[PDB]
Amino acid sequence: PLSVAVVGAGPRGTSVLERLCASAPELLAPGVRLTVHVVDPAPPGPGRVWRTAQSEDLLMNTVASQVTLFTDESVNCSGPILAGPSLHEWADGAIGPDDYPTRALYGRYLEWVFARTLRHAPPSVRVETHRARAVRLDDAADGRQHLALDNGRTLTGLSAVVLAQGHLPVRPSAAVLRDTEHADRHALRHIPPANPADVDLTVISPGEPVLLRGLGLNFFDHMALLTTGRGGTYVREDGVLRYVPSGREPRVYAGSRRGLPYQARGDNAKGPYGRHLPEVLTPEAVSAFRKRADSGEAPDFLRDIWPLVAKEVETVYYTALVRHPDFAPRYLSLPYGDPQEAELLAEFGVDADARWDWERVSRPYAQREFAHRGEWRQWLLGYLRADAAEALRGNVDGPLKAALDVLRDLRNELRLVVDHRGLRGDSRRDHLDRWYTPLNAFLSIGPPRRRIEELTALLEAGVVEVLGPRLEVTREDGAWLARSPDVPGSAVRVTTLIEARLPEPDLGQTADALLAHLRETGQCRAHVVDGYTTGGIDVSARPYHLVDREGVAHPRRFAFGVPTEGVHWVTAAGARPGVDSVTLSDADAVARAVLRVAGQ
Ligand SMILES: Cc1cc2nc3c(=O)[nH]c(=O)nc-3n(C[C@H](O)[C@H](O)[C@H](O)COP(=O)(O)OP(=O)(O)OC[C@H]3O[C@@H](n4cnc5c(N)ncnc54)[C@H](O)[C@@H]3O)c2cc1C
Ligand SMILES: NC(=O)c1ccc[n+]([C@@H]2O[C@H](COP(=O)([O-])OP(=O)(O)OC[C@H]3O[C@@H](n4cnc5c(N)ncnc54)[C@H](OP(=O)(O)O)[C@@H]3O)[C@@H](O)[C@H]2O)c1
Ligand SMILES: N[C@@H](CC(=O)O)C(=O)O
Ligand SMILES: N[C@@H](CC(=O)O)C(=O)O
Ligand SMILES: O=C(O)CC[N+](=O)[O-]
Known part of the structure; x- marks a missing residue:
């Protein structure tokens, strides 16, 4: 019987599965049964980033009315338009249209979209889920695909495999390895690049001097986890926020090369669907x-x-x-x-x-x-x-x-x-x-206004200090020394160094076993533009066939989303409604290619 696999059941893999179910009545012959294997070490729909068991202190950067996993009549794709609720419509008055949901609330929406996709599946499609990491992909002797999972199961006879692997771990840089060794010699805490939701901050003590190296969205998460996440609260008086300390907060220092917290997003006045339409870049x-x-x-x-x-x-x-x-x-x-x-x-x-x-x-x-x-x-x-x-x-x-x-x-x-x-x-x-x-x-790509108003109150209270431009950090006996060369007297010895940024997509330094295997055996390669090597995995034009070391496009392998950064620009973004979302039309094109390679 026919089989396919989706590797990754975050938003992009979930969207592929919804698009597979939508087109399967048109593109599979009558009587044909297709099994879709869905593989993620995290519960499917939210995946790892949006999992419901994470801290409720962490927010999205998108208003609730602009978050969806469903196609709409604006979307130019070949599969059928199947309308569903935005996060704001589904959330049943729990959140306002121009307010920023918790990451866990988007998880609860995604877990529900997944459960709904299984309920609306046509009878030609059976879904099987696997709580496991995929670690090898190979050709079988007949050209069908074999996918080896880290729970010892092998999926064999696959007509196609979709890689929707999103935000992958990276091997630490030379600088990250020196700082991790320094922490080991002096009993310090070094936290390498990661989703802030995945880090254990309970090892930081009250009053400890901590450097957040970074002033972008990861910075705003750690800022929340080390304050309101430790019993801090805000009060508003005469318009103006005041922070109310719990006494469990560390001494937070932060800096970056530019030296500034990211710009506040203007409060949304464009509604759910409003987009500037270009008049110069037409x-x-x-x-x-x-x-x-x-x-x-x-x-x-x-x-x-x-x-x-x-x-x-x-x-x-x-x-x-x-x-x-x-x-x-x-x-x-x-x-x-x-x-x-x-x-x-x-x-x-x-x-x-x-x-x-x-x-x-x-x-x-x-x-x-x-x-x-x-x-x-x-x-x-x-x-x-x-x-x-x-x-x-x-x-x-x-x-x-x-x-x-x-x-x-x-x-x-x-x-x-x-x-x-x-x-x-x-x-x-x-x-x-x-x-x-x-x-x-x-x-x-900065935070909501509310996060700039919170940081300002934390600066007034002295719980956060921003060190200044061109942050320099050096290793010393028993600490790191952080200073800004543009701000005299900014020097501070810290005992926790947090790298407050996500790992960037880098095929060459990947820590995913599956892509490392594909790279070593010559089954994928880095996307190169005239002699410049990017961090992205190389794919053809839509529907994004995987390209091998020799430049050969695979008929049965497709890769979609964050790992293609280099081929594609700013892959780390969800679908928006009413704007002909490419994320939704890309999921539809990938699903229809999978059904055509199975449905011969
Ligand atoms: C902290 C953070 C905050 C964000 N906030 C926003 C926001 O507010 N708004 C927005 O629009 N975008 C946001 N994003 C961008 C994000 O890229 C998208 O919203 C979306 O999550 C991308 O979906 P994806 O399925 O491509 O990747 P992911 O959501 O990363 O999902 C990938 C999944 O693949 C799985 N996987 C990977 N390798 C394997 C393997 N070998 N075997 C099995 N499973 C595997 C992982 O477990 C994971 O579940 C944020 C990203 C992060 C990291
Ligand atoms: N609230 C949310 O929903 C949320 C939370 C976290 C992550 N995200 C997602 O994840 C993406 C990435 O977030 P991010 O915080 O990693 O990036 P970011 O928002 O662009 O901020 C990165 C910060 O680290 C500094 N920096 C970057 N590379 C560095 C390096 N190699 N060494 C030292 N400092 C470095 C940058 O400042 P300088 O620029 O001057 O170096 C900047 O201050 C976001 O764009 C978003 O898609 C969203
Ligand atoms: N229109 C085709 C594919 C294409 O030729 O773009 C589809 O039906 O998916
Ligand atoms: N993904 C786009 C909008 C869309 O889905 O086309 C964004 O960057 O926000
Ligand atoms: O220069 C800018 O970006 C803003 C214009 N201004 O004078 O405020």
Whole structure:
């Protein structure tokens, strides 16, 4: 009887299984039975990231109304549209549409979507689940696939295998190994990169000096786990938050290279489905870029794409600032950086001090010097208060946060420009991966406003200190020494060093046994763009056949999501409703390819 396997039962594997069930009546012949084997060491639907047994202190970064695992009539795919509830609709008044759910609540939605998919399965499809890791994949003698699980079971005779493996562990860097050894010699705690939900922070004591190395979304999780996760609470008075200490908190120090907590997301005013529709990086502009990459002269990100992104953002900022119907048609007719930009702005009442400045938004401390810790702290509090107040105006009427939310909305169009070798390799390396991607995350993949208002109260209470720009950490007898070379008096000896970031996708350093096996035996390879090696596993165009060391696309193997980062840009994002989600149309295309390779 026919069999297939899905490796990974997080959102992407669950979505493949829902799309398999949707198309199986059209693409399997009458009377044919298909067994789908679903393999995850975590209960299926939520997988490891969204498991319901995690701490309720940890939040999503997406509003509840924009979280779904179901296709909708906007989605351009070949399988049938099967409407279901968003997290907000399913949650039955437990959460507001513009509020941020707990990660455990998304888990409970995902466990229910999985149980519902088994209830709605057509009679041609039997699902079998396996609480296990897959550790080897091989060709059988007839060309069907063998999948070996770490519980000693082997699945044989498979017509197809889908790898939906998401956020995988990585072997520690040389720096992470030196710091782990230093912790062993001096009885310290070193916590390497990980989902904050997976780390044991109960080993940190009250009053202990702790460095969070990182100021991004992992930082905001550890900030919550070491405060409200230890009996801390907040109270609001005259608009303004105050932190109420439990006495169990450590002394929290934090820093990074840029030295700033990530920007607050503007409060959502676009509803469940609202997206900035591009007027500079248009589908017409994107088609022309894809035509040049196709004919072998790929665009340069900095020369050719960045000026369109910059114009897109600046136009939205100025349009929200000027609020006159005639302004934007006149501004959009001007080329990016033309001298008439400045003169048109002056004519609509915009002074030189309200003008966009990419250098200031990137490093807003760089005009000034800091004489001691105290001057850094007062500057930083002023900066975070202004950030929270811009975010309260929302992502439609607030000019700054409307403009930075363009960067979140444009990801669809940037993916179509840069994915599948749409850039030259040297531009991919030096412009996208080393400059745009980290700036973009700082500006547009930051926390809810509430997290910036909490951090500000923690800074006022002295429970958190941010050390300052260009964080330096050195190993000493009995501690690490952390300082900012831009903030005199910032030096502090800590006894816990937390690397507050996730492992990035890296096939070359993977700690997954299955991909290490495929890499050693020449059955997968790193995606390469003109001599630049990315961290991504190489796949064909949709429906994403796995490509072997010699460049051969496998007919029975497909890989989908985070492990393809390099082929694809910003894979670490769920489906949104009403916007022709590529995550949903990719799941549908992968499911239909699996059913066609089985259904011969
Ligand atoms: C901490 C964190 C917070 C996030 N917050 C948000 C957010 O707020 N909003 C948002 O849109 N996105 C968020 N994301 C992005 C995330 O990438 C997606 O939401 C989504 O989880 C990706 O789904 P996936 O199935 O590709 O990967 P994952 O959710 O990582 O699921 C992969 C699954 O595959 C399993 N697996 C891997 N290897 C094997 C193997 N060899 N055998 C068997 N099973 C295997 C794992 O156990 C895991 O269950 C977040 C990610 C993380 C890590
Ligand atoms: N709340 C949530 O839902 C949540 C929680 C956690 C994770 N996530 C998901 O996971 C993704 C990654 O989160 P993240 O916190 O890893 O990344 P992130 O949000 O981009 O923050 C990474 C931080 O680490 C610093 N940094 C990065 N690489 C470093 C390195 N090699 N050495 C030292 N410092 C380094 C960066 O600051 P500099 O930039 O100056 O170095 C930055 O402060 C998010 O984008 C999101 O998709 C979401
Ligand atoms: N339209 C086909 C595949 C394709 O040719 O794109 C499908 O039915 O899935
Ligand atoms: N995944 C996209 C939206 C979509 O599903 O196309 C995002 O980055 O938020
Ligand atoms: O420069 C920016 O990014 C914002 C414009 N401003 O003057 O606030």
